[PDB]
Design a protein around this ligand. Structure first.
Ligand code: CLA
Ligand code: CLA
Ligand code: CLA
Ligand code: CLA
Ligand code: CLA
Ligand code: CLA
Ligand code: A86
Ligand code: A86
Ligand code: A86
Ligand code: KC1
Ligand code: KC1
Lengths: 179, 162, 176, 170, 168
């Protein structure tokens, strides 16, 4: 919300530098998207932290196709390694949350998820502002991290485990790009 | 700090260095505390050295381990042959004294008065003249004992007979 | 307020140099230095237990240097065996934490996060944990200093010394 | 309160027998049975999760009968393959739970424990979790019942229905 | 208050000696003893569980006396297998607990640590769980007072009392 100053944190303040908020109704649409994109991209960043660390389940993801959990790539192509009979299950459960349980039509972003004494907002309202800003700020940093993780695999061809094993962290002197 | 316990018929308020030429009572009562803290240890250390140099021992068997009291040497070498299970007990109990029961718990009427109303061997039967010289005695007895005990250890490592 | 905390029962308000009555304008920075030196030493003491228990991560901290995490010594020479490009990455991030996230020019030490996130609702349950941070912080200052001088005097780290049973300084080969 | 606790979003006050208005005082008894049938069936679903996941207790449950924790089946025949002296220990200890300790007469549900030791201080958050226990309780009554009809019509446990590839009945 | 804190429903006040207004101001200490005897008995009976389940500490208690952690018996004579600097370290440290940090002289039983760090604001929440600290302390007090008479009368410790068929 604008009046509490939820997204405006202390390094930059009200960081709308290109002038996109020209009234109050288009802020609530944009914050509903920013908070939703931040919640998706945070679980996307914890995915790449877990996948590129090699932490896999034991057994077969698809035993009728013989596809182990170990032979899914930890990079940007690992989701499509998965058989489409299997990730139709992912789209159908996540689509059921998006329409019924956590309806993404709710622009407020509240879905009542309260983990009680870890947020007693009625007796410490400063913890409300701390946890509301940190949901956006960790979502904004993970939105740029997953755009980092995606394009670093595209321009190098290696995933994050492979380009860190090679020490390939500089776009200069390598055989890739015109630099 | 002209007339109190350190003021003295041979040398009244000696003070050569730059310690207390001000009115800071809290500086003085800290330094007065440690001077009898060093004196009360060193008084028992003069006696505690000269019973070991005279060869007097406890009747034997400092441990179940087969080490007697006469086997333990005298001077700085006593520290190396005391069994380490018992040398923890010496440091733990002296630490138990120095933390808990050695204090101005209840408030004495001077510095170093550690009678908490628990143990008192008199101190009412004095004529208010004799109290302050009888702790000016133990200040000066503690004064000479720490130059006494420092002489016994500088000359043990030197080897000079005293 | 802040001038009565740090003063617990066995001594009270303990200032043998008397700088509370003499220079009260320098106290709240000196409290901030005491709290920061405490919090640094508490993570430093805990680090020495974790290092000397041989809890290492895996692999190489610097694969160009061919230097594993277990190749790091567990004593004083451990942070200096890390390569200089690696030490520059620690200090650049710790300067980002100590100037931007937890700015150490903020002298009350209060950075938005509470005690495990929560603000202590009571005022003297707050003062009890404010004293427990200071007292554990003051105890860890002597703990990390007592671990650094006792490594460089005995020549061994804390695993090395404890393996050897070199606990008694009176019957070994040392000074006195 | 309490009568507004089984009303979440989609069907609300769903009731195709009219036992709303038929007997309104025989509700505090029926909600206490609904809450206890939910708490039993919720622990029974998670039990069938952990049995068929082959998490075992590493020992003997009755060494006098010479059966150990890793040979009684992870299906419907679990407490049939338990000796009667051990089954007498279960029903006598929970006799102390069901009347002497936190009882079943106590239709409030409200013994002393709360949600992870503590009370929820928001009433709207407290009424939310009260629906969640009912909802998850109601789903697990259907869940644990559909787990043991699906194994007595099949002949295999949960573990063998999945490891076989025998999922879809057609 | 401290008077209600130990009464539950199946016995109530239950005072066969009647020491409630026969010497009534000696309550305030002999609750503080029952809370103390409670807390040291439940810490000693969950320790007796973990001793006989063989969870031992991987190493040597005293390498100078060649004492492994599995060397110590898991029963009543396990406290006697401690060496002499071993239980000198115990009562040196717990003299700094029982006089200084957690002074057992303080009859409140309240040393500012709360129940897992929080102070329980709701007055019948916290009156409930101080009834639990007393009741679980009472049942633990004959918990291992019935364990040590269960070793010294048959000789075996719990792990071999149970690996024998010697329960009934
Ligand atoms: C999901 C995308 C998304 C959306 C809808 C918003 C929306 C908002 N942000 Mg947030 N933000 C985001 C992601 C997003 N943000 C990310 C990833 C960061 C980290 C860089 C931030 C950092 C940030 C700060 C620090 C602040 C905001 C603030 C705001 C609010 C102010 C209006 C504004 O600037 O709109 C943005 C304009 C648009 C979304 C429309 C333009 C769309 C462009 C043209 C698409 C092209 C993007 C390009 C492909 C990739 C960009 C990355 C690239 C530079 C590498 C508005 C609610 C302010 C606030 O909340 O104040 C209360 C505020 O202080 N944002
Ligand atoms: C154990 C340490 C110690 C401490 C903290 C003190 C402290 C004090 N002494 Mg005492 N003194 C000591 C040992 C000590 N003394 C010993 C062992 C002797 C016997 C030689 C004396 C003989 C003595 C006399 C005759 C007098 C004092 C007096 C004093 C007081 C005035 C300040 C002063 O001049 O002290 C001297 C400062 C030091 C001893 C600190 C040593 C610093 C040096 C650099 C260390 C290296 C040597 C002060 C309370 C005066 C007093 O009490 O008047 C009321 C006084 O008249 N002292
Ligand atoms: C009052 C309780 C108490 C009890 C039961 C003991 C018991 C013991 N003491 Mg200890 N001790 C105590 C208090 C006590 N002490 C006190 C108050 C002091 C004065 C600081 C000591 C100073 C002491 C020393 C110096 C030694 C012992 C030693 C011993 C042990 C005898 C030898 C052995 O190893 O077995 C024995 C277990 C000896 C030991 O530890 O043997 C290796 C040993 O050398 N004790
Ligand atoms: C058996 C335990 C049990 C009990 C005692 C109750 C009791 C209640 N339910 Mg609940 N409910 C349950 C389980 C139970 N429910 C289950 C398993 C579901 C489906 C998941 C529901 C779905 C449900 C909804 C959506 C609502 C209620 C509501 C109610 C209240 C209104 C009266 C009513 O309609 O009850 C129903 C009557 C009975 C349970 C008595 C027995 C009826 C027959 C004999 C049961 C057997 C039928 C059949 C054989 C079962 C086969 C299941 C499966 C194998 C196919 C009442 C407190 C309402 C409420 O909470 O209002 C606030 C409400 O809105 N119930
Ligand atoms: C609680 C929700 C729930 C869910 C998610 C399932 C899910 C399933 N049921 Mg079950 N079942 C349920 C409740 C549920 N059931 C209930 C309430 C009953 C009636 C008491 C049954 C009685 C039942 C039978 C008889 C069978 C299934 C079977 C199945 C499997 C069918 C797969 C397919 O492709 O078609 C699937 C795992 C079939 C199966 O083969 O399971 C392995 C099967 O034969 N179900
Ligand atoms: C409080 C009463 C109590 C007493 C007197 C003992 C006594 C003993 N314990 Mg046990 N223990 C206890 C409770 C107790 N335990 C509890 C509550 C736990 C769980 C934390 C343990 C966990 C434990 C392990 C893992 C081991 C022992 C071991 C031992 C034996 C010697 C070494 C030692 O001191 O271990 C350390 C002492 C503790 C960890 C006690 C914790 C006391 C705190 C204050 C309770 C709160 C000695 C017989 C060792 C042994 O030889 O086992 C056979 C051993 O390896 N204890
Ligand atoms: C070189 C190398 O390789 O490393 C080596 C180095 C080294 C050091 C040699 C090694 C070693 C051996 C070590 C360090 C052994 C230390 C063992 C340790 C630390 C043993 C704790 C005992 C405390 C007990 C039993 C408490 C009883 C407490 C009781 C009965 C209470 O009631 C406590 C109380 O609080 C409550 C619970 C209830 C309250 O109402 C009342 C009070 C307050 C009183 C190793 C392992 O070999 C590895
Ligand atoms: C006989 C035998 O051997 O047993 C066999 C049995 C059987 C079944 C054959 C076996 C198997 C294979 C199995 C079970 C494979 C599946 C494993 C699993 C657990 C698969 C989860 C995927 C979900 C994902 C990736 C979520 C994306 C979610 C995304 C991208 C989101 O953003 C979600 C969201 O919530 C947020 C974060 C933000 C919200 O604002 C909104 C939404 C809703 C969008 C075994 C192991 O072989 C053993
Ligand atoms: C019939 C009727 O009307 O009843 C009435 C009448 C009556 C009797 C008058 C009333 C009363 C008062 C009662 C019942 C008082 C009983 C109090 C009781 C039973 C108090 C236990 C202390 C045990 C402790 C502190 C733990 C020691 C053990 C410790 C500290 C250990 O370390 C365990 C140990 O294994 C290890 C871990 C390590 C070893 O190295 C040491 C040992 C081996 C020991 C009542 C309440 O009104 C009820
Ligand atoms: C922003 C993303 C990022 C990248 C992409 C990256 C990459 C590398 N890190 Mg760095 N790093 C951080 C961030 C990043 N690091 C952060 C947040 C910290 C916590 C303060 C941190 C700490 C250290 C330390 C102690 C060392 C270190 C190293 C390397 C080196 C390994 C390859 C090699 O050295 O062969 C590669 C290039 C080692 C080193 O520099 O060795 C000369 C080393 O010792 N890192
Ligand atoms: C704390 C006191 C206590 C003792 C001393 C004790 C002893 C034995 N129990 Mg145990 N028991 C509990 C407590 C105690 N039991 C509790 C609180 C529960 C949960 C309600 C419980 C559950 C079961 C089950 C399911 C079985 C069981 C058994 C045995 C049997 C093992 C050796 C033997 O086989 O004779 C010996 C006598 C098995 C059995 O009875 O086999 C015929 C068996 O199947 N128990």
């Amino acid at each position: 919300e604008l009046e509490d100053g939820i997204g405006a944190v202390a390094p930059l303040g009200y960081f709308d530098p290109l002038g996109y908020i020209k009234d109050e109704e288009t802020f609530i649409r944009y914050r509903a998207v920013e908070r939703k994109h931040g919640r998706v991209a945070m679980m996307a960043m914890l995915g790449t932290f877990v996948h590129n660390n090699g932490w896999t389940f034991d057994g077969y993801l698809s035993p009728s196709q013989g596809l182990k959990f170990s032979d899914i790539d930890s990079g940007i192509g690992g989701l499509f390694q998965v058989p489409p009979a299997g990730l139709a299950q992912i789209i159908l459960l996540c689509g059921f949350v998006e329409l019924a349980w956590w309806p993404a039509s709710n622009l407020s972003g509240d879905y009542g998820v309260r983990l009680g004494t870890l947020n007693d907002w009625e007796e410490q309202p400063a913890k409300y502002y701390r946890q509301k800003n940190a949901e956006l700020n960790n979502g904004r940093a993970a939105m740029m991290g997953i755009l980092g993780t995606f394009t670093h695999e595209v321009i190098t061809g290696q995933n994050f485990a492979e380009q860190a094993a090679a020490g390939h962290f500089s776009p200069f002197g390598d055989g890739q790009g015109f630099f | 700090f002209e007339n109190e316990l350190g003021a003295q018929p041979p040398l009244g308020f000696f003070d050569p260095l730059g310690l207390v030429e001000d009115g800071n009572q809290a500086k003085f009562d800290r330094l007065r505390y440690v001077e009898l803290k060093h004196g009360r240890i060193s008084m028992l250390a003069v006696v505690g050295y000269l019973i070991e140099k005279a060869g007097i021992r406890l009747p034997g068997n400092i441990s179940y381990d087969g080490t007697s009291f006469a086997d333990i040497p005298d001077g700085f070498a006593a520290l190396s042959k005391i069994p380490d299970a018992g040398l923890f007990q010496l440091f733990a109990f002296i630490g138990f004294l120095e933390v808990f029961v050695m204090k101005d718990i209840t408030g004495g009427e001077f510095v170093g008065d550690f009678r908490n109303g628990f143990i008192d061997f008199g101190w009412d039967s004095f004529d208010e003249e004799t109290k302050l010289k009888k702790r000016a005695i133990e200040l000066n007895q503690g004064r000479a004992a720490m130059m006494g005990i420092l002489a016994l250890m500088v000359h043990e490592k030197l080897g000079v007979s005293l | 307020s802040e001038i009565e905390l740090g003063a617990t029962e066995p001594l009270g308000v303990f200032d043998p140099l008397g700088w509370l009555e003499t220079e009260p304008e320098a106290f709240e920075r000196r409290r901030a230095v005491e709290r920061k030196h405490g919090r640094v030493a508490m993570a430093a003491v805990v680090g020495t237990i974790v290092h000397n228990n041989h809890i290492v991560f895996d692999g190489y901290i610097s694969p160009s240097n061919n230097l594993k995490f277990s190749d790091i010594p567990t004593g004083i020479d451990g942070i200096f065996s890390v390569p200089t490009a690696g030490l520059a990455q620690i200090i650049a991030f710790l300067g980002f934490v100590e100037l931007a996230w937890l700015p150490a020019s903020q002298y009350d030490g209060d950075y938005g996060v509470g005690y495990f996130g929560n603000d202590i609702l009571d005022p003297e349950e707050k003062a009890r944990k404010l004293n427990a941070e200071l007292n554990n912080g003051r105890a860890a200052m002597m703990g990390i200093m007592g671990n650094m001088v006792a490594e460089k005097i005995t020549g061994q780290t804390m695993y090395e010394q404890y393996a050897a049973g070199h606990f008694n300084p009176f019957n070994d080969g040392e000074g006195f």
